[PDB]
Structures are given as C-alpha cells and as structure tokens.
Amino acid sequence: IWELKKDVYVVELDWYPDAPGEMVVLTCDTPEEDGITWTLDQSSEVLGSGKTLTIQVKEFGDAGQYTCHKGGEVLSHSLLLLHKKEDGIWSTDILKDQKEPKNKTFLRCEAKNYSGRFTCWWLTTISTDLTFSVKSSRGSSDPQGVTCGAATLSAERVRGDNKEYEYSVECQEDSACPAAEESLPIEVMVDAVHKLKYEQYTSSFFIRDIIKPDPPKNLQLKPLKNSRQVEVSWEYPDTWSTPHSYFSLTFCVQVQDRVFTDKTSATVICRKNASISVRAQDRYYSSSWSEWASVPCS
Amino acid sequence: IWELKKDVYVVELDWYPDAPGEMVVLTCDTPEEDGITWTLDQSSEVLGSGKTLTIQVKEFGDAGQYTCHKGGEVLSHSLLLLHKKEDGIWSTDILKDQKEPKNKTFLRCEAKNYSGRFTCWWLTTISTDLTFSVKSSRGSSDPQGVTCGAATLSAERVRGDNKEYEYSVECQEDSACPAAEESLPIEVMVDAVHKLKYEQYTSSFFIRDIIKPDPPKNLQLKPLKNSRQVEVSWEYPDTWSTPHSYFSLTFCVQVDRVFTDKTSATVICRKNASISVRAQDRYYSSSWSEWASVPC
Amino acid sequence: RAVPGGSSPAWTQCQQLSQKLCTLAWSAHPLVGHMDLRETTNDVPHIQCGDGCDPQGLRDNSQFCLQRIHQGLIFYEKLLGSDIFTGEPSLLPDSPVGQLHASLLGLSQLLQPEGHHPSLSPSQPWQRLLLRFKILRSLQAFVAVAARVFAHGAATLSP
Amino acid sequence: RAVPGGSSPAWTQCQQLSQKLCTLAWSAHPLVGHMDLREEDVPHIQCGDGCDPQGLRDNSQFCLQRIHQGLIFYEKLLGSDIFTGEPSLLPDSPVGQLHASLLGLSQLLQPEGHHWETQQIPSLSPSQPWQRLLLRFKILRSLQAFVAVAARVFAHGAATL
Ligand SMILES: [K+]
Ligand SMILES: [K+]
Structure with a gap:
C-alpha cells in the first residue's frame, strides 16, 4: 500500500483474487482519541473502531473511501484503489491500445x-x-x-x-x-x-x-505562364528547431507520385484539379514525416 | 573400426593423435588356422601368426594393407584406413574448401x-x-x-x-x-x-x-522497320520441370536488365552488345539459369 | 472419409495474390538469410507428397490440396502473430513481415472466407530471430508450392 | 587543459560525406526490425560536447573531436566479426559502404590520430549469430543517432563557416 495522493492509496494486489491479498491498516487522521468508527464508501456499517482500522484486501469490494467518525462528524478519509495483476500481468482496462503503432x-x-x-x-x-x-x-x-x-x-x-x-x-x-x-x-x-x-x-x-515536424509553412504555387507547370515553394514550420542550418529538414512534394528535395521549392506540373502537398522529415534521421501542407492546383 | 568397401576398413582416431590410438584386430579370412603369417602392405617382416593379428593403429605407419599368408600363399587382405580428428575437426584435406557460399x-x-x-x-x-x-x-x-x-x-x-x-x-x-x-x-x-x-x-x-534451371531455348527476335528495337522470345528448356503451367519460370533480359514472366519481350537493341536472357523459378528465389544470348 | 471437394476458388486472384505472396515472403526474408546449418522439428504444415498439389493430382482432386494450403497459411499466419515476431526486437505491422501477415490472412480468406480454427515462448530476443528465420525460410517453401498450385489452376482448371 | 582548437574541416566534403552516412545507417532487417533501445559501451555526442550550434560557433574542435571518436569506434565495431560473422553479409552491401564511409569521414577529421591512443578497441564476441545479429542492429541503431548529429554539425558548419 502506498499513497498516490493525500488520503488516497493504491493497494498492490499481485496475484489479484488469490492468496490472502493484503492486510491494510487505515488511520484516522485527527487529534481525537475516543469513539472513532470506520465506514466504507456509504454503508452506515461500523467496520471497526479505534484510530486505526485493519482490513484485508482482495477485490474491489475491499477498497473504496474509508471514513472515520466521532460524534457524527467526519474526521478524515482514506481512499483505497487497487492495482491488479491479471493473469500475471498488470491491467490496462483504462487506455485504448491506440491502433498499435506498434x-x-x-x-x-x-x-x-x-x-x-x-x-x-x-x-x-x-x-x-x-x-x-x-x-x-x-x-x-x-x-x-x-x-x-x-x-x-x-x-x-x-x-x-x-x-x-x-x-x-x-x-x-x-x-x-x-x-x-x-x-x-x-x-x-x-x-x-x-x-x-x-x-x-x-x-x-x-x-x-x-520528432514529427509541423507541416511546411506557407506552401505557395506560381504557374509558369501558358504553363500547366508550377513553382512550388514552402518554408520551415514555425516550430522547427532553429537553426535550420543545423536542424535541417527534407521534403516530399507529391502532386496527385512524389518527389523528394532538401530544398524549400520544386517545380511540378499542375494537372489542374489535383493539388500539391508537401511534407517534411528530419533530414538526417528517420523520424516521422510531418503532416501534409497542401495547396490546390491553379 | 568399420568397413568402407570389402577388405577395406576405416579406423577412427577420434583422439588423434594421443596414445594409445586404437587397437585393431586383423582377421585373416580363410577356413584354415595353421601356418598363417602376416605382412604389412607390400613389405616383408612377418608381423605375426595365427588367424588373427593384433595391431595398434595410431598413424599411417600402422595402417595400410595387411596380408594373410599360408605356405607361399596370400589367403586374404585387409586395408586399414585412417580417419583422423585433429583439433576436434575431422580432416578436410582431400577436397577443396571452395570457400564459396559460404x-x-x-x-x-x-x-x-x-x-x-x-x-x-x-x-x-x-x-x-x-x-x-x-x-x-x-x-x-x-x-x-x-x-x-x-x-x-x-x-x-x-x-x-x-x-x-x-x-x-x-x-x-x-x-x-x-x-x-x-x-x-x-x-x-x-x-x-x-x-x-x-x-x-x-x-x-x-x-x-x-535448383539451377537450364538456359531458355531458341532466343528468336523479330525487329521492326526503321528501328534499333526488337521483340524477343525464348522457351523454357527441356531439362526444366513439366508442366510449366505449374512449374512456372520467370525470366530476365540483359543487353539495365528487365524481367518478365512472359516468354517474350520488346527491347531497344543496338549493334553494341547482344541480348542475353535467363530463367529463375518464379516462385522460390533459387539459382538464376545460365545466360542465353542471340547477339543483336 | 471421401476426399472432400467442391468450392472453386478464384484461381486468378488466387494465383495473383499467391504470387504477390511469394515475392512478399522473400522481401520479408531475402536470400541474404542464414546458411544455417542445423531434429524432428515442432513442425509446421507442409504441402506434402500426396496432398494432391502435383500438376497431375490436381486434374482431379484439388480440395484436399487447397485445405492443406489454407491450413499452412493459418499456421504461418498465426505464427506472425505470436510474440515471436511481436517480442523483442518487435516487428512492426507495416514492416515487410506484418504485410506477409496480410497476404497470408488475405490469401487464407480467399479459400475459406470464415473456415474453422502454437508453442508460445521463449523470451530472450536472441531466440526470436532464430525462429523468425526458421519460420520464414520454412514459409517461403510452403507458399512456393502454394503458388504453382494456384498458378496451374489458373492456367488449366478455369475458365 | 584548455579546450583544443585548430583545423577547420571540409564542411562541404563533410556535410555530404555525413549526409550519406545517415542514409546507409537506416538499413534495417525485415526479421530483426528496428532495434530498441533499453539502456545502459559506445561513444556519444553529449550535451557538454559543443556540437550544439551555439557551441559550434564558439569552438567545435572538441565536438568534431568527439565525432572523430565516434566514427573511430563505430568504424572498429563494423569491422569486427560482428558484421563479418554470419548471417554473412557482403562488402558491397549497405553495411559494406557503411564501414567504408565511416572510416572515410574518420580520416577526413583526423587523417589518422597520428596513432597515439585512438584505441578503445571494442568489447568482444558474442559467437552464435543470434546475439550477433541483434548486436549488429543495436550498433546500427546507436549509429543512426550518432551520424544524425554529426550531419547536423557539419551541415551547419558547412553553411555558417
Ligand atoms: K484497454
Ligand atoms: K581442403
């Protein structure tokens, strides 16, 4: 048993529902020395008296908020949570196993x-x-x-x-x-x-x-004239580590067939309807590619 | 000690070459039993008598061809061979390490x-x-x-x-x-x-x-008019497994190399080099067949 | 009981998928593998002798053969699941392996679209690689036959 | 001592030379997959090593000096039986060009440590390819990150000096 936060305690049941579990002793925190009683969660049921209640803990019915009282006054608490070893491995019931990545x-x-x-x-x-x-x-x-x-x-x-x-x-x-x-x-x-x-x-x-960079900043198109072909340009995302001379990024310009360039610009062919998207990665380490920065073909 | 061929035996020196080596018992094959004598290989020096000879093999000197004898006669033999284990490895002298793969x-x-x-x-x-x-x-x-x-x-x-x-x-x-x-x-x-x-x-x-399929057969091309191009063809070789319907090959096409599963193809051919093609089993990456060209 | 029989299958998406399958097997464990050399083995299914996957044994029965085939996929396909590939150094889903895991489960799904179905251990990432390889080389073998099997059917049984 | 100083390198030569390194070191093996990670004998570009852009301007000899150290050490490892044992991989392989390029850039920093010290010759073994294989990739792992900083160091010096 350990204190996760004031008046809140975790009870480690390795073996969960098995054995004797664990023998917890609770303590009423108060000057008061006389007529202390213990109740669990609600239940008017006195579970013991004394400034300390000693209990056994196996399942959830064993934990909850413990309360001590004297003359109908609440004196202090003691919330018990359980940490459970399910089939030899702790529990995960809480968080979702995020599409295994991985x-x-x-x-x-x-x-x-x-x-x-x-x-x-x-x-x-x-x-x-x-x-x-x-x-x-x-x-x-x-x-x-x-x-x-x-x-x-x-x-x-x-x-x-x-x-x-x-x-x-x-x-x-x-x-x-x-x-x-x-x-x-x-x-x-x-x-x-x-x-x-x-x-x-x-x-x-x-x-x-x-590291996963923000998508390229200020993605721009600039057609060539009587040309279905464009000067793409972008910038380093505001958040990227500075300086970019050191913290360099590499880019992927996909029209839609992608192209890669450690430059903040490229020249593509607008197939007018599609659009150019650009994304960055650490130039020197296979971190994660940012999200796409996209700009509609002209 | 066991037999390799007849009359030819091997002697295992697993501990070569620490003493005592092995203690071979030579047995002369004949129904007789008196006046028997023995020599090593082709040397005289009667090594001993009786239907049997008890030798101690440790080295090639102990090995060789033992010969039985009964009155000016050679009843039988016994060729003792040595199989030596040095440094915990049987020898690999005879053959070439051909240190290839691997x-x-x-x-x-x-x-x-x-x-x-x-x-x-x-x-x-x-x-x-x-x-x-x-x-x-x-x-x-x-x-x-x-x-x-x-x-x-x-x-x-x-x-x-x-x-x-x-x-x-x-x-x-x-x-x-x-x-x-x-x-x-x-x-x-x-x-x-x-x-x-x-x-x-x-x-x-x-x-x-x-698997090392054979080279494809009959590389036969048919170029087009006013072009340094040719559509080419081969055929599985006969050594290959039948039916190709199942025992499918896939090919290559040199001159960069191109690859098809089709007995045909079309590639820009110049008088420079020539066209070679080979076959690998389509389903398991094993040996690539030898080449087969029909120079442009 | 009598040699089962009946159900097609799509000889082509079969011969198709199956051959894309082989390339996969290899990509996920190239010839640049482990020239061993090493057992009764806790064996895997094998498209064995009289499983009827010969060019001939197929002319008539292909059902037993296919059931076999599918059974292997189930085996291997399961294996790629196992902590063996999950364990350290964990193989990622999109990694050439987890795509085998695709093809298999894919191909398996094209024989029996529901059907009806491992040793576990060890630990020491040390030992996972070794299995990863045994299994792979083993697999590339299975799917090979598997391919030709579907190749033939494509070529000779259908249309 | 006082922090060393001196020979400013071929930033450009180095930049490109390093850059190539970051490519070769992300090889990866289908079956091994991507090695993690759990610590924890290998050099490191640390905090106080001066490769951070700010220190790089003040000086960078100590940093560059560490990089040489790193290259030298990885270089040794790559040569060892680790990558030469089986699953026997070819000298033309990504790993071949690796040891190759490592050294190359080592040389480009310290055209041989005049050969006073420069040792730290690798731990040893392991025998039996499984541990071996893992080790191979653990080292390749560490390397990706090493080479990554270097590339930044050079690519930066390259631009700012
Ligand atoms: K969960
Ligand atoms: K030899």
Whole structure:
C-alpha cells in the first residue's frame, strides 16, 4: 500500500483474487482519541473502531473511501484503489491500445522539435471518474527532471460506436539539449485513476524518435505562364528547431507520385484539379514525416 | 573400426593423435588356422601368426594393407584406413574448401528441375590415388532412398597454377515427388579416400534451394522497320520441370536488365552488345539459369 | 472419409495474390538469410507428397490440396502473430513481415472466407530471430508450392 | 587543459560525406526490425560536447573531436566479426559502404590520430549469430543517432563557416 495522493492509496494486489491479498491498516487522521468508527464508501456499517482500522484486501469490494467518525462528524478519509495483476500481468482496462503503432501503446508521444518539449496523447472510452497524473523523467538509474503539465483532455471525437476521449500533457525536459545525442530515454509514467481501479501506463523513448515536424509553412504555387507547370515553394514550420542550418529538414512534394528535395521549392506540373502537398522529415534521421501542407492546383 | 568397401576398413582416431590410438584386430579370412603369417602392405617382416593379428593403429605407419599368408600363399587382405580428428575437426584435406557460399563448402549440388535428379561436384587438388564413393538419402530417421551413380571425374581446369580436379555425380531420389514442400533434407555423404587417409564430406539440401534451371531455348527476335528495337522470345528448356503451367519460370533480359514472366519481350537493341536472357523459378528465389544470348 | 471437394476458388486472384505472396515472403526474408546449418522439428504444415498439389493430382482432386494450403497459411499466419515476431526486437505491422501477415490472412480468406480454427515462448530476443528465420525460410517453401498450385489452376482448371 | 582548437574541416566534403552516412545507417532487417533501445559501451555526442550550434560557433574542435571518436569506434565495431560473422553479409552491401564511409569521414577529421591512443578497441564476441545479429542492429541503431548529429554539425558548419 502506498499513497498516490493525500488520503488516497493504491493497494498492490499481485496475484489479484488469490492468496490472502493484503492486510491494510487505515488511520484516522485527527487529534481525537475516543469513539472513532470506520465506514466504507456509504454503508452506515461500523467496520471497526479505534484510530486505526485493519482490513484485508482482495477485490474491489475491499477498497473504496474509508471514513472515520466521532460524534457524527467526519474526521478524515482514506481512499483505497487497487492495482491488479491479471493473469500475471498488470491491467490496462483504462487506455485504448491506440491502433498499435506498434501494439500495446496507450501513450503515443511526439515532439515538434528537439527543444525537449513533447506531448503524449492517450485514448480512452471512459468519460467519467478519470484522474490522470503524469510523471516524466529522463533515465531511471539516476532520474533527470521532466516537468509535466497535467493531463487535459485535448479533444474528444467520435469512433462511430461511442465517444473516444483524447488526453494529453505537455512536458519540458527541465534542462534539455536539442543538439545532443540522447543516450538515455525519457519515461513518461501515467497514473491512470478510474474510480477504484488503478493503472500505470509507461513510455520510454528518445526525443529523436518522437520528432514529427509541423507541416511546411506557407506552401505557395506560381504557374509558369501558358504553363500547366508550377513553382512550388514552402518554408520551415514555425516550430522547427532553429537553426535550420543545423536542424535541417527534407521534403516530399507529391502532386496527385512524389518527389523528394532538401530544398524549400520544386517545380511540378499542375494537372489542374489535383493539388500539391508537401511534407517534411528530419533530414538526417528517420523520424516521422510531418503532416501534409497542401495547396490546390491553379 | 568399420568397413568402407570389402577388405577395406576405416579406423577412427577420434583422439588423434594421443596414445594409445586404437587397437585393431586383423582377421585373416580363410577356413584354415595353421601356418598363417602376416605382412604389412607390400613389405616383408612377418608381423605375426595365427588367424588373427593384433595391431595398434595410431598413424599411417600402422595402417595400410595387411596380408594373410599360408605356405607361399596370400589367403586374404585387409586395408586399414585412417580417419583422423585433429583439433576436434575431422580432416578436410582431400577436397577443396571452395570457400564459396559460404565457407567449408566442399560439395556443390544443383538440380535443373524437380525430378530428384541432382548432380554434385567437389574440387580436389589431388591427382591420383583417390576413391569417392557417394551415398545419399532423404532424412536420417527412416532414411528415404537416393541412388548415386559413381564419382566420375569431369572438369580439369587450372587454378592459380596447380591443376584443379572436379568430379560430379548423378543422383536420383529413388522415389521423388517434385511438387511437394520437401520438409526433410537430402543427404550427401562422400566417402573420400586418399591413399591411407579417409574423409567424409557431407551436404544437406532441399532441391528447391539447389535448383539451377537450364538456359531458355531458341532466343528468336523479330525487329521492326526503321528501328534499333526488337521483340524477343525464348522457351523454357527441356531439362526444366513439366508442366510449366505449374512449374512456372520467370525470366530476365540483359543487353539495365528487365524481367518478365512472359516468354517474350520488346527491347531497344543496338549493334553494341547482344541480348542475353535467363530463367529463375518464379516462385522460390533459387539459382538464376545460365545466360542465353542471340547477339543483336 | 471421401476426399472432400467442391468450392472453386478464384484461381486468378488466387494465383495473383499467391504470387504477390511469394515475392512478399522473400522481401520479408531475402536470400541474404542464414546458411544455417542445423531434429524432428515442432513442425509446421507442409504441402506434402500426396496432398494432391502435383500438376497431375490436381486434374482431379484439388480440395484436399487447397485445405492443406489454407491450413499452412493459418499456421504461418498465426505464427506472425505470436510474440515471436511481436517480442523483442518487435516487428512492426507495416514492416515487410506484418504485410506477409496480410497476404497470408488475405490469401487464407480467399479459400475459406470464415473456415474453422502454437508453442508460445521463449523470451530472450536472441531466440526470436532464430525462429523468425526458421519460420520464414520454412514459409517461403510452403507458399512456393502454394503458388504453382494456384498458378496451374489458373492456367488449366478455369475458365 | 584548455579546450583544443585548430583545423577547420571540409564542411562541404563533410556535410555530404555525413549526409550519406545517415542514409546507409537506416538499413534495417525485415526479421530483426528496428532495434530498441533499453539502456545502459559506445561513444556519444553529449550535451557538454559543443556540437550544439551555439557551441559550434564558439569552438567545435572538441565536438568534431568527439565525432572523430565516434566514427573511430563505430568504424572498429563494423569491422569486427560482428558484421563479418554470419548471417554473412557482403562488402558491397549497405553495411559494406557503411564501414567504408565511416572510416572515410574518420580520416577526413583526423587523417589518422597520428596513432597515439585512438584505441578503445571494442568489447568482444558474442559467437552464435543470434546475439550477433541483434548486436549488429543495436550498433546500427546507436549509429543512426550518432551520424544524425554529426550531419547536423557539419551541415551547419558547412553553411555558417
Ligand atoms: K484497454
Ligand atoms: K581442403
């Protein structure tokens, strides 16, 4: 048993429904020494007295909010969540296994640059009784500061059947080096609380491996005259790491058959109706290609 | 100690060459039992008497050809061969490492089709006093049958300088199956004997891995008027497996190389080079057939 | 019981898909593989001898043969699922492998569009590669016959 | 000591030479797939190593010096039996041109460390190709990232010096 946050505790049942489980002792936090009683969640049922209640924990009926009272007053609580080892492996009931990119993901992070600021997005069906604490550091054997900004719900969209809830956090590695070649991965540990159930989801990665650039900025067309052929041009996205002399990007100009150019321009043939889309990638490392920047053929 | 051929025995020196080696008992074959004497190879020096001779083989000097004797007579023989294991590796002297793909490859085998008919060569720098006896089989537990028609000497090129001798052998799986996913490999065992030494060379292969179709036949082109172009054609070779309806090949087309599964094609031909084409089994990437041109 | 029989199949999308299938098998594990050399094996299905996948044995029965074929795909197709390819170093879905996994499940779907159906372990990524290869070379073998089988049917049984 | 100084390199030569490196190092093997990752003997372009654009302007000899170190080390590894053991891969292969180009660019930085030190000759083994194969790709992995920074270093010097 450990304290996930004030008056809230996680009980590790390795073996879930098996064995004796675990013997928890709760404590009423109050000066009061006399006539303390314990009740669980609602139930007027006194489970014990004394400033400490000692219980056994196997299933969810074992956890919940414990409350101590004296003379009809609530004195303090003690919410117990369970962390459950299902068939020898922790539970994941919470986050959606994000189209396996690839397999068993839950946390899909990415960075618009080597600044040391990445965002991780996770997916859930769950609309309510959801709490999400985000802890990030770089390296275990001797952690290294990552400030995490609290899990918002970045957007919510429909998956046809039922709604899909998209969370997200921003994180800045406190003292980061964009130029450097990372040797130690960031881990993002996500404390997933849904009601009584407790789950942790983790991601370890190098920023270089989660870089996905914003799409090219200011994509422009410029026809040649009495020519169904155009001067395409774009710019580095505002967010790309600077300087571009160092932090270079490579481009893909697809009309629609794509072409690749480490230049911010190319000359295509408008098949007037289609349009030119351009996307960038790290020029020097197979990170992820940004999204397309598209401009309608003239 | 076991028999290679008749009267010809091998002596396993697994520990070559630490003492005591092996203690061979030579047995003279004859119904008689008195006045028997023995000599080594072709030297006199009566090594001993009786129907048997107890020798100690450790080295070639102990080996050779033992000869029985009864009154001015030679009743029988016994050729003792040595199979030596040095540094935990049986010798691989006889045959040439042919360090190709990959190393320690002493046996080449190819099949021009799926009949179960394969051929295998070996490269020896040796010139004489050899004997290759091949045996093959499919599998080891309950070995299927494979019939090998004697180690014949064929090619006789010239390496860096010293001559290179090549033998090869016909081999038909007693009961083949072509179209089947062979799941058990073929086993080649070459009992090589260089005078008193003896080695064994083995190879394991599924036909599919060793397929080397023949070169396509009748490359016949038909160019067009006022063009350095030609539509060309070939035909599977007859060695190939029948029906091509099933036993499909796919081809190549040199002069960059172009590839079709069609017995035909159309390519811009200049008087410069010439047109070569080959065939690989369409379904399993195995050996590419040799080439076949009909110079522009 | 009697040799089953009946159902076509689309000899061509079959002979088509099947040959695209072989190229796949190879792409996902080129000749630049492992010249071994190594067993009774925890064997896979094999388009064996009298499974009737000969050019001849097909003239009449092709049903047993196809059932076999499909059975293999099921086997291999399952295998690509296994942690064997999932485990470290995990093979990605779009990677040449996970596309085999496609073709297979694809091709399998074109024989039996529903039909009716592994050892597990080990760990040590060390051992996954080895299997990954055994399985692959093994597979490339299966699909080969599988190809010709469908090639013939395309050529001779249909139209 | 004082941070070294001196010989400004063929940024252009280097830029292109590095650039090619980032290509060759993303080879990848269908069956091995993309090696991850878990730490953790291999050099690194670190924070305090001065390859970041800002340091690069101040100086860059220390950085460039590290890059030479890296190239030298990967170069050694690539030569070792690791990539020469089986699944035996050809000297014309992507990996061949790799060791090839590595060295080349090593040379282009330190045309031989005059040969005082420059050692750190690789760990050793492993025997039996599976561990081998993995190792091959782990190194290729590390390399992708190494070479990636270098390319930025040069491509940057190349433009700004
Ligand atoms: K889930
Ligand atoms: K030899």
